[model samples]
Target: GMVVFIDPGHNGANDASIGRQVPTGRGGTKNCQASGTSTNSGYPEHTFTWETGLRLRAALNALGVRTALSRGNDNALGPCVDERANMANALRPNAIVSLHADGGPASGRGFHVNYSAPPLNAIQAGPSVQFARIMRDQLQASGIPKANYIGQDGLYGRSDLAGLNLAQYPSILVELGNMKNPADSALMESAEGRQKYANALVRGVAGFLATQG
Candidate 1:
């Protein structure tokens, strides 16, 4: 059995709670949330994350998987990063997945999966790494290349994301593609391309879940 927490990155308006500062889950603090990003032609990352999340949730439902959501809708104010992480911890999902897209340099391309580096807890150090790797492998099966400009292969060990930093369970944040690059932009904005990502992510989560007791 699995309870998956699906967090689609960023809120619709990018107004309330967006710029507020919050605990970094470290000793310091950072902004509550960023507006995610948009394709060079103007497709917002919030929409991409939200739409992909809907697709993944539907497929998960059909597979008889249980699920929870952090962001209620595209138009709502943030449940804020820390608040969302707080909510996720309480719900105690088997694995948590956050969807996002990067507005990196135009020359960079493809996807990357991020997990807490120098992990603060046991689960983050092991299970979360396994989740990211399985998900990275699954995403590559969708014909999307691993990010060439960012991490080695498709995985990134991050320290700054308050979302992953605060996670208590096996959790990861996926950058579906780089919004600033032409190749990634085309794929991310296309319906077929999105379905591929949703399917890949579903497999990633299910694949990770299958290994647990």
Candidate 2:
């Protein structure tokens, strides 16, 4: 009986509001925040993330895992990044994932998983790194390639992301794809696309939990 933390990043508020900074690296230059780019036809990243979050949450429920969302509305302003981490920690979830989509060069594509790298002097156990790898494998099977534009073979194992740093439990973040890429966006905007994402996520999570290792 484990609780799962599901965070759908980029709320509708922030998505459409234009430039704003949410803080990075103890006060690094505030980055120019563009509302996530969308498909040429206007399929939005916010919409996709919210939809897939719900779909994945439902799939997790069916798997008998208690799932909780970071925000209920697509425009809840924000639950804030640090706040998001805090919420997951408060729940003491067995595993946590922040769902997000990337926007790059108006051309880059594919999915990527961000896992915490070596070093665990904080609040959570190190075992959850396996959770990230399992998810990447399932997503690969779903036709989402490892991010070709970032990460190690497109897999990023970082020590800087606060989502993993502040968590009092195992956590990972999934950057689904670049919405600006028509090919990727076309699939992400479809019912079948969400279904594929949901199934892959569920399969990955279940496989991780069932591990006897």
Candidate 3:
């Protein structure tokens, strides 16, 4: 009975904002539902992420865990990143995960998970770190390579993100892949591509829940 919250980043409306200036800081700059970055071929990253988020939700539902989406539709929305985190707290899910794809140096690729540092909202730092370790282990076991760009040896922590900063439950932000990279982008945009991502996520979440009891 682990209640999980899956947050899919960005929105489709952002696609129409190619020239519009947005804002960001330590956490991020674009809108929580901004049209996500995409592949060179024009596959919308935001669209792909929203699709994956829903698929993940369906999978979680089958598992009988109460789940909620920080953003429901790819369009018609405005939920700041910080607000999404707060929403998760109000629900007090067992775990909260924010789903996204990265756009970075072509050489930097693969999946990465960001956990919270010490003084984690209300939970002790120990269990928070344990959740990260389990996520990394399960992700690796699923054959998803460690992120080439973040966290030494495949794990990372940041206290600035509102999601991590204010979270009361174990929370993590999962960058499924670097969308700007050709190889990663190919997989990230496909229907089959996201299903694999969803499956791996299910495995990771199930692994974490399995260890909790």
Candidate 4:
């Protein structure tokens, strides 16, 4: 049996009042959460990630993999980035993923994964990178392209993301697509598109688990 954590990026109530401030794993403090980006037509990143998480959970559960969410619902405020990591740490899941959609330039498109970098101790870096590679390949197999303007080859390493910085298990934050791009927005806003993303993510997790055995 395997438990996995799925953290959807923001919430419907992610406004200035709710996102005040919070402690970081790296000794600093940052916003509790943020009202994430939106598509030109008003579809929000929070809504997109929440739906994806739901679909992904169902897909994984169908395979006998248990899943939990950082936030219970879409309308709730954030659990904060550090809190998200702590949740994963406490659950000790096999793998944890934070879902988001980028607000990059309207011209930019595709998707990328962000993982922990060195100096953050790289505690799970090895396995995280491996999971990311599998995730990237699986996403491509589902028709999404590697990000053109973000991290090289659609993988990024950063010491700054609290979710990755404080995670004690293999973890990554996946920017599913660029909401600012018309093409991506169309896909992200479509039910079929979201299901494609969820299926791809489930396949990635399945592939990784197969290797672990």
- Candidate number of the best TM-score: 1
Q: Poorest 10 consecutive residues of model 2 by lDDT?
A: 25-34
Candidate 1's C-alpha lDDT?
0.91
Kindly provide the TM-score of model 2 when superposed on the true structure, using C-alpha atoms: 0.85
Alpha-carbon deviation at 94 in model 3, angstroms: 0.6
| Each prediction's TM-score versus the true structure | 0.97, 0.85, 0.85, 0.95
Q: Which is better, 2 or 4, measured by TM-score? A: 4
Per-candidate clashes come to 0, 0, 6, 0
Candidate 4, 1-213: lDDT as tens digits: 898898888876765665566666677877777789999999999999999999999998999998989998878666777778888899988889889999999889999988888735554657888988999999889999999989988888877787887888888899999999988999999999999999988998888878776
**lDDT tens digits by residue: candidate 1, 43-87:** 999989888999999989988889898877888676889998999
Which lDDT tens digits does candidate 3 get at residues 153-181?
56777755556666778788888888888
Ranking by lDDT, best first? 1, 4, 2, 3
Q: Please, what's the RMSD in Å of model 1?
A: 1.0
- lDDT for model 3, please: 0.74
Error of 3 at 169 (Å): 0.9
Runs of candidate 2 with Cα error greater than 4 angstroms are 15-35, 122-125
